Design an enzyme around this catalytic site. Sequence first.
Site, PDB file in Angstrom:
ATOM      1  N   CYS B  43       7.313 -30.363  29.859  1.00 22.01           N
ATOM      2  CA  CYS B  43       7.756 -31.320  30.865  1.00 22.01           C
ATOM      3  C   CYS B  43       6.894 -31.592  32.088  1.00 22.01           C
ATOM      4  CB  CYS B  43       9.139 -30.899  31.352  1.00 22.01           C
ATOM      5  SG  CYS B  43      10.166 -30.257  30.028  1.00 22.01           S
ATOM      6  N   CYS B  46       4.368 -34.816  33.002  1.00 20.91           N
ATOM      7  CA  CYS B  46       4.976 -36.044  33.496  1.00 20.91           C
ATOM      8  C   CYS B  46       5.753 -35.812  34.765  1.00 20.91           C
ATOM      9  CB  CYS B  46       5.986 -36.583  32.497  1.00 20.91           C
ATOM     10  SG  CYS B  46       5.352 -37.323  31.015  1.00 20.91           S
ATOM     11  N   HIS B  47       6.612 -34.810  34.725  1.00 19.74           N
ATOM     12  CA  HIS B  47       7.472 -34.519  35.850  1.00 19.74           C
ATOM     13  C   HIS B  47       6.889 -33.767  37.039  1.00 19.74           C
ATOM     14  CE1 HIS B  47      11.313 -36.136  34.308  1.00 19.74           C
ATOM     15  NE2 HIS B  47      10.998 -35.698  33.103  1.00 19.74           N
ATOM     16  N   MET B  84      11.043 -41.453  28.653  1.00 21.50           N
ATOM     17  CA  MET B  84      11.553 -40.093  28.509  1.00 21.50           C
ATOM     18  C   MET B  84      11.754 -39.793  27.024  1.00 21.50           C
ATOM     19  SD  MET B  84      12.655 -37.164  29.360  1.00 21.50           S
ATOM     20  CE  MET B  84      13.559 -35.937  28.380  1.00 21.50           C
ATOM     21  N   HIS B 323      -4.327 -44.086  38.998  1.00 22.18           N
ATOM     22  CA  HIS B 323      -4.855 -43.113  38.056  1.00 22.18           C
ATOM     23  C   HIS B 323      -6.374 -43.170  37.902  1.00 22.18           C
ATOM     24  CE1 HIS B 323      -4.995 -41.122  33.919  1.00 22.18           C
ATOM     25  NE2 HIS B 323      -4.477 -40.217  34.725  1.00 22.18           N
ATOM     26  N   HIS B 365      -4.868 -48.811  31.268  1.00 23.67           N
ATOM     27  CA  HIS B 365      -5.653 -47.592  31.176  1.00 23.67           C
ATOM     28  C   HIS B 365      -7.087 -47.994  30.912  1.00 23.67           C
ATOM     29  CE1 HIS B 365      -7.418 -43.811  29.849  1.00 23.67           C
ATOM     30  NE2 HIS B 365      -6.406 -43.206  30.432  1.00 23.67           N
TER      31      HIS B 365
HETATM   32  C1  DHE Z   1      -7.340 -38.723  36.769  1.00 24.01           C
HETATM   33  C2  DHE Z   1      -7.914 -38.823  35.382  1.00 24.01           C
HETATM   34  C3  DHE Z   1      -9.104 -39.399  35.018  1.00 24.01           C
HETATM   35  C4  DHE Z   1     -10.081 -40.098  35.919  1.00 24.01           C
HETATM   36  C5  DHE Z   1     -11.030 -39.212  36.604  1.00 24.01           C
HETATM   37  C6  DHE Z   1     -12.222 -39.844  37.205  1.00 24.01           C
HETATM   38  O1  DHE Z   1     -12.885 -40.671  36.504  1.00 24.01           O
HETATM   39  O2  DHE Z   1     -12.540 -39.540  38.399  1.00 24.01           O
HETATM   40  C7  DHE Z   1      -9.249 -39.231  33.602  1.00 24.01           C
HETATM   41  C8  DHE Z   1     -10.268 -39.685  32.774  1.00 24.01           C
HETATM   42  C9  DHE Z   1     -10.596 -39.273  31.491  1.00 24.01           C
HETATM   43  C10 DHE Z   1     -11.824 -39.433  30.797  1.00 24.01           C
HETATM   44  C11 DHE Z   1     -12.998 -40.146  31.322  1.00 24.01           C
HETATM   45  C12 DHE Z   1     -13.767 -40.968  30.687  1.00 24.01           C
HETATM   46  C13 DHE Z   1     -14.693 -41.939  31.311  1.00 24.01           C
HETATM   47  O3  DHE Z   1     -15.256 -42.791  30.580  1.00 24.01           O
HETATM   48  O4  DHE Z   1     -14.881 -41.879  32.557  1.00 24.01           O
HETATM   49  C14 DHE Z   1     -11.688 -38.820  29.575  1.00 24.01           C
HETATM   50  C15 DHE Z   1     -12.686 -38.714  28.476  1.00 24.01           C
HETATM   51  C16 DHE Z   1     -10.386 -38.266  29.516  1.00 24.01           C
HETATM   52  C17 DHE Z   1      -9.829 -37.495  28.506  1.00 24.01           C
HETATM   53  C18 DHE Z   1      -8.481 -37.267  28.268  1.00 24.01           C
HETATM   54  N1  DHE Z   1      -7.514 -37.452  29.202  1.00 24.01           N
HETATM   55 FE1  DHE Z   1      -7.812 -38.071  31.153  1.00 24.01          FE
HETATM   56  N2  DHE Z   1      -5.835 -37.578  31.589  1.00 24.01           N
HETATM   57  C19 DHE Z   1      -5.374 -37.400  32.859  1.00 24.01           C
HETATM   58  C20 DHE Z   1      -6.045 -37.663  34.045  1.00 24.01           C
HETATM   59  C21 DHE Z   1      -7.294 -38.296  34.185  1.00 24.01           C
HETATM   60  N3  DHE Z   1      -8.169 -38.514  33.143  1.00 24.01           N
HETATM   61  C22 DHE Z   1      -3.976 -36.872  32.801  1.00 24.01           C
HETATM   62  O5  DHE Z   1      -3.318 -36.433  33.706  1.00 24.01           O
HETATM   63  C23 DHE Z   1      -3.511 -36.999  31.371  1.00 24.01           C
HETATM   64  C24 DHE Z   1      -2.595 -38.307  31.334  1.00 24.01           C
HETATM   65  C25 DHE Z   1      -2.699 -35.856  30.901  1.00 24.01           C
HETATM   66  C26 DHE Z   1      -3.424 -34.634  30.590  1.00 24.01           C
HETATM   67  O6  DHE Z   1      -3.074 -33.963  29.592  1.00 24.01           O
HETATM   68  O7  DHE Z   1      -4.368 -34.300  31.333  1.00 24.01           O
HETATM   69  C27 DHE Z   1      -4.859 -37.283  30.689  1.00 24.01           C
HETATM   70  C28 DHE Z   1      -5.084 -37.261  29.346  1.00 24.01           C
HETATM   71  C29 DHE Z   1      -6.269 -37.268  28.666  1.00 24.01           C
HETATM   72  C30 DHE Z   1      -6.379 -37.048  27.219  1.00 24.01           C
HETATM   73  O8  DHE Z   1      -5.459 -37.029  26.416  1.00 24.01           O
HETATM   74  C31 DHE Z   1      -7.867 -36.817  26.925  1.00 24.01           C
HETATM   75  C32 DHE Z   1      -8.300 -37.878  25.768  1.00 24.01           C
HETATM   76  C33 DHE Z   1      -8.172 -35.423  26.471  1.00 24.01           C
HETATM   77  C34 DHE Z   1      -7.726 -34.301  27.331  1.00 24.01           C
HETATM   78  O9  DHE Z   1      -8.540 -33.359  27.527  1.00 24.01           O
HETATM   79  O10 DHE Z   1      -6.552 -34.301  27.830  1.00 24.01           O
HETATM   80  N4  DHE Z   1      -9.734 -38.616  30.664  1.00 24.01           N
HETATM   81  C1  HEC Z   2       6.651 -38.040  30.007  1.00 25.68           C
HETATM   82  C2  HEC Z   2       5.762 -38.262  28.780  1.00 25.68           C
HETATM   83  C3  HEC Z   2       7.849 -37.139  29.971  1.00 25.68           C
HETATM   84  C4  HEC Z   2       7.993 -35.910  29.430  1.00 25.68           C
HETATM   85  C5  HEC Z   2       6.909 -35.085  28.729  1.00 25.68           C
HETATM   86  C6  HEC Z   2       9.369 -35.505  29.764  1.00 25.68           C
HETATM   87  N1  HEC Z   2      10.001 -36.445  30.560  1.00 25.68           N
HETATM   88 FE1  HEC Z   2      11.799 -36.419  31.379  1.00 25.68          FE
HETATM   89  N2  HEC Z   2      11.545 -38.231  32.027  1.00 25.68           N
HETATM   90  C7  HEC Z   2      10.395 -38.991  32.036  1.00 25.68           C
HETATM   91  C8  HEC Z   2      10.658 -40.328  32.564  1.00 25.68           C
HETATM   92  C9  HEC Z   2       9.690 -41.468  32.669  1.00 25.68           C
HETATM   93  C10 HEC Z   2      11.944 -40.373  32.909  1.00 25.68           C
HETATM   94  C11 HEC Z   2      12.723 -41.567  33.404  1.00 25.68           C
HETATM   95  C12 HEC Z   2      13.738 -41.971  32.339  1.00 25.68           C
HETATM   96  C13 HEC Z   2      14.606 -43.148  32.748  1.00 25.68           C
HETATM   97  O1  HEC Z   2      15.125 -43.834  31.841  1.00 25.68           O
HETATM   98  O2  HEC Z   2      14.777 -43.390  33.970  1.00 25.68           O
HETATM   99  C14 HEC Z   2      12.501 -39.051  32.598  1.00 25.68           C
HETATM  100  C15 HEC Z   2      13.781 -38.601  32.936  1.00 25.68           C
HETATM  101  C16 HEC Z   2      14.273 -37.331  32.730  1.00 25.68           C
HETATM  102  C17 HEC Z   2      15.628 -36.902  33.038  1.00 25.68           C
HETATM  103  C18 HEC Z   2      16.794 -37.703  33.622  1.00 25.68           C
HETATM  104  C19 HEC Z   2      16.734 -37.908  35.125  1.00 25.68           C
HETATM  105  C20 HEC Z   2      17.974 -38.599  35.666  1.00 25.68           C
HETATM  106  O3  HEC Z   2      18.050 -39.846  35.575  1.00 25.68           O
HETATM  107  O4  HEC Z   2      18.868 -37.890  36.177  1.00 25.68           O
HETATM  108  C21 HEC Z   2      15.711 -35.625  32.638  1.00 25.68           C
HETATM  109  C22 HEC Z   2      16.903 -34.706  32.752  1.00 25.68           C
HETATM  110  C23 HEC Z   2      14.458 -35.295  32.063  1.00 25.68           C
HETATM  111  N3  HEC Z   2      13.582 -36.345  32.105  1.00 25.68           N
HETATM  112  C24 HEC Z   2      14.170 -34.030  31.596  1.00 25.68           C
HETATM  113  C25 HEC Z   2      12.965 -33.651  31.058  1.00 25.68           C
HETATM  114  C26 HEC Z   2      12.746 -32.361  30.488  1.00 25.68           C
HETATM  115  C27 HEC Z   2      13.595 -31.125  30.683  1.00 25.68           C
HETATM  116  C28 HEC Z   2      11.607 -32.505  29.775  1.00 25.68           C
HETATM  117  C29 HEC Z   2      10.815 -31.538  28.977  1.00 25.68           C
HETATM  118  C30 HEC Z   2      11.506 -30.606  27.973  1.00 25.68           C
HETATM  119  C31 HEC Z   2      11.078 -33.794  30.010  1.00 25.68           C
HETATM  120  N4  HEC Z   2      11.939 -34.527  30.799  1.00 25.68           N
HETATM  121  C32 HEC Z   2       9.876 -34.253  29.517  1.00 25.68           C
HETATM  122  C33 HEC Z   2       9.204 -38.557  31.499  1.00 25.68           C
HETATM  123  C34 HEC Z   2       9.036 -37.412  30.737  1.00 25.68           C
END
Ligand code: DHE
Ligand code: HEC
EC number: 1.7.2.1
Lengths: 538, 539
Positions: B43, B46-47, B84, B323, B365
């Site tokens: 969780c 995202c959260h 979610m 982002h 993205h």
């Molecule tokens: C803030 C951010 C940047 C920009 C930084 C910059 O350029 O200064 C970025 C860029 C990137 C870039 C930059 C590429 C470029 O061309 O600049 C790559 C290769 C990349 C590989 C991945 N990213 Fe990324 N990425 C996140 C955050 C970010 N990634 C997350 O929080 C997210 C959604 C969840 C996570 O698990 O971290 C996420 C998932 C991914 C993936 O799933 C990737 C494919 C593999 C991984 O290791 O999680 N992100």
């Molecule tokens: C992103 C890829 C998510 C992951 C991983 C999990 N959650 Fe989530 N959750 C997310 C969003 C964008 C939202 C909004 C949903 C909507 O229709 O508004 C939510 C919401 C919840 C809630 C309900 C909140 C409320 O309205 O009271 C709960 C209880 C919740 N999410 C629980 C939760 C848990 C326990 C998770 C992991 C096991 C989890 N979320 C993962 C995004 C994402």
Amino acid sequence: AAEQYQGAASAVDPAHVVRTNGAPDMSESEFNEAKQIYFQRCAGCHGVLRKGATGKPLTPDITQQRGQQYLEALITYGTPLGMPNWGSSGELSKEQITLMAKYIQHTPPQPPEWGMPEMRESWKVLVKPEDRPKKQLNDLDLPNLFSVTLRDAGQIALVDGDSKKIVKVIDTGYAVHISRMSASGRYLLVIGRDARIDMIDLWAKEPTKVAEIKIGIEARSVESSKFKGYEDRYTIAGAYWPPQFAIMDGETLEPKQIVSTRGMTVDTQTYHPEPRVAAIIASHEHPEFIVNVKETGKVLLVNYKDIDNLTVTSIGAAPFLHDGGWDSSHRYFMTAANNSNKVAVIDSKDRRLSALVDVGKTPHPGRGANFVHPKYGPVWSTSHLGDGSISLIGTDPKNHPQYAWKKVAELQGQGGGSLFIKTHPKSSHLYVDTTFNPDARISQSVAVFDLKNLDAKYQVLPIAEWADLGEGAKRVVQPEYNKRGDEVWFSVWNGKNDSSALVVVDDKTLKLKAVVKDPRLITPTGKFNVYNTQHDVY
Amino acid sequence: KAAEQYQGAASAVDPAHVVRTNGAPDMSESEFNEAKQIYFQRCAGCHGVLRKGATGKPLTPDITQQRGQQYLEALITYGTPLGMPNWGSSGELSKEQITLMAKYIQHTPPQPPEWGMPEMRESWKVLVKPEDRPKKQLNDLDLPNLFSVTLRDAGQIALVDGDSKKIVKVIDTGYAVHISRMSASGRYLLVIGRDARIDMIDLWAKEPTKVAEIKIGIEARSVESSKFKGYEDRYTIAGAYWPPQFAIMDGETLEPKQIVSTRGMTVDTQTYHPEPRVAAIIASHEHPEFIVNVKETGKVLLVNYKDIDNLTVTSIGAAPFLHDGGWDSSHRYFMTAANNSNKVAVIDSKDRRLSALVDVGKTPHPGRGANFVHPKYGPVWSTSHLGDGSISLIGTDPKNHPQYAWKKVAELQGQGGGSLFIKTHPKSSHLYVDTTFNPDARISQSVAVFDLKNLDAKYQVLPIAEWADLGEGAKRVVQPEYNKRGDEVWFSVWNGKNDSSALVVVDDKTLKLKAVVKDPRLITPTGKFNVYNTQHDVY
Ligand code: DHE
Ligand code: HEC
Ligand code: DHE
Ligand code: HEC
């Protein structure tokens, strides 16, 4: 797709995220009883989240480590380092002290936040700009008017300087801390410890409130833009809780920007959850506000040239920044870092820390006292709470480089507990109070030095005795001059059910001049002469 | 005692309004810890750590206790059509575990440790002093054409030779390096793991080696170097997810200099957010500053490094959920994505102001984006989306094309949603678009290619993973990347850790398979950064 994108595990290790407890179970009535004592008696020093005082924080990691008995003994007997004894003195009972020890072993309860929605909800325009006078609709001598704080009554009284009579009493927020004037000299701004600000129009038939707003749950400072071409443009206010400051329309008080002061300390460079906002002063060199952030020891230069995209210059100083004021030239901000026993010098022109001067135990200058020394050139002085000294610091890098930012000399007053030192360009006297001095006679009187003969010892003016008030602590506080500089006012801050007064002294003779009594004058504290506040004359 | 009476009065704060948190369902240590493990494994991304990171209502006790056990178990079980996921219906978690999660989120969020200067210095290490390093290049490698590839699960990165297609050196780094960046002198390669561990690599040594390392937080994503004239290798900035902060360090040694908190007020509601994660960071060419993206508060900060002792920061408000992003052709406008806000924010790095907020598709993205000259619209910057199969083309020339500047001038259609990177090059007439997270295996294993000379024609689908000849596994193709001369584009075949992966090189001129990089050490290859193109922002 987006659910798989953000679906990997957090890099944060669950094994290092800790659940908090193992604290002594206490019922709701017991927790509330302890909580009530904590904000009435403890919070002021320790803070909301209990990290505001020197020494170890009262957070569960430390408190549970100390244990129930260690805490009970510490609260009971206190320490010689600033922690009062609550049991020995007999202030709290052993049953209460026990509740207090258990209480601080629990996670600190959370006070509400206070953002734009809350701010706007409290914002009120009482009289629209367009519906306001185009001229002064009264015969009052506004420049020589005094805005006096009637602390416990939650009001302020405007006192006519020459007649010595109360022109108008106004309802404000609780226990107003300071009064500030707008650059135009028309509007009066006051803020209560409850974070409620009140804007007052001195041009109205009867000076009255035109707007109000609450900027937090607890506050102390307010200020107006004083840079050329920015008269009445913006008004800023700093809060204790939440840790933040807000910028508003200087004409209507509409909230515009809100900035958080939560951050990294200057000394250890670690995160502090509650850096309270202390003094604020407007720059004359740039269109910026100079904000003091206490616990993290930072002085922020907030530029208002473009309020939409705020630019802030964070200058490191020293821990526990509090009050302060301009040097004679209005370029260097002389502010005290009380618990650090230092005076930070902030150059408002070049925008950097000019020096950190070592002074006495717990410096408390207010806005300070500026005067030219026969030997060391122009200095800035401050008295202390910790001891009876008075520090004179050089402020002339140009003509007196050898004495600049040095504690050039020292004077000795009646003792500690001092709060305010005062003088005037037209005066040759230097006044200093001793409000919190444990001795009644000392705290009920002030010291006066001869600026034409500094080697000579001070004289003692019996302010409280002159008021002829009867019973009560009769603490005298803050010297304040009139616009002419030939009268010095003092407050005889007695209790709310006791009689208080404002004493005036002829500066030219040091003789009693007048005594302001009135049933409405309840617990008078700060007094701010309009012209002198507006033009930073000290 | 004087100062004790001075600070002795009551706080202006009303005790009655200061609240004690509780009324949550009882759960033992075994139970609480188990739910907590699932929370950060499933969780948190995202959260967030403190549960205010996703859209919609936060998972803080005030709201969760309001919904109650039943409501919470039900939502966690089926999810919502708004992002979610469903954890019960998919069989991901059991009803037993879901009941635990519903109880867990009704409790106060456990606190992770802070990470200040003392922790940072403790972690700081200078492996090779500036005095002991080479004065010139001691190897004969073509450094500008080198590819810094992330061997994600392996906790390493691999430097691959552009022309020979071979792995030159494999270096141990922090876990799952997220991005690679080049210093302005082209000598030092910087990498940062999701665990906030940064590694500085000297490309001039006989065999490229690490010279310094540091951990700037608990979780992080970005690192960046000073690129303003006269500041080559002066400073290095890194942003963290936890704690909410960024850190400025010495560019030659990585010595920690300043740490700034990003906790603050949001741009939209202007309320306090206790966890504004630091996202993308780009270095300005107009002023000696670092442009920092603060996600949840939607703030773009311009941090001036001309004097790091007295830090000056200009806070520009954009839109929530900032982002990723990158420069426009001229390198003045920072085109960044506020993905959940379905917008692209334009930051004028010269005038230092928000130039505009462009409306785009569902969940933009762009990565660093793709720049090219449109026949009808002039200079445009483009981006693809995770939420749909569209490609937005935005005009970026206000000087000579004001009619189109900052407008979603036109659209293109790719294979579908789940897109992560769009790409092109000054010398190329092609435009690539991947589909890494698309639910269709065939689409996720291929890339769409457009013809810049004939933008009306439908894209050609290149079978990247099939060309790889790898066998089983998801085999997701991700992030196109050109070489130094921009005549070949590289792709990553991100297969499982226990499976086989590869890098596939395509002849840009002919759109034909040119080479396939395989190696036992090439585990979970993700990001690839060509030294020249990364360092000079060629995209
Ligand atoms: C803030 C951010 C940047 C920009 C930084 C910059 O350029 O200064 C970025 C860029 C990137 C870039 C930059 C590429 C470029 O061309 O600049 C790559 C290769 C990349 C590989 C991945 N990213 Fe990324 N990425 C996140 C955050 C970010 N990634 C997350 O929080 C997210 C959604 C969840 C996570 O698990 O971290 C996420 C998932 C991914 C993936 O799933 C990737 C494919 C593999 C991984 O290791 O999680 N992100
Ligand atoms: C992103 C890829 C998510 C992951 C991983 C999990 N959650 Fe989530 N959750 C997310 C969003 C964008 C939202 C909004 C949903 C909507 O229709 O508004 C939510 C919401 C919840 C809630 C309900 C909140 C409320 O309205 O009271 C709960 C209880 C919740 N999410 C629980 C939760 C848990 C326990 C998770 C992991 C096991 C989890 N979320 C993962 C995004 C994402
Ligand atoms: C931050 C701060 C300033 C600077 C404002 C500026 O320049 O913008 C200030 C100034 C002031 C000034 C400004 C005078 C001046 O000449 O500038 C006055 C009169 C004043 C009356 C008091 N102050 Fe003050 N004061 C605090 C805070 C502050 N006081 C506290 O937190 C403290 C230590 C504890 C408390 O109980 O609030 C405290 C106690 C007091 C008092 O005990 C006084 C005498 C009465 C009261 O209302 O509590 N403070
Ligand atoms: C300022 C005028 C204070 C008030 C009012 C209260 N405390 Fe305090 N306390 C203060 C200081 C400066 C210090 C440090 C003292 C030292 O010698 O180090 C303390 C310390 C404590 C402690 C001990 C912390 C530790 O070492 O573990 C406790 C338990 C404590 N204070 C409790 C406390 C309570 C419950 C109070 C109100 C009834 C209270 N303090 C008021 C300053 C001030």
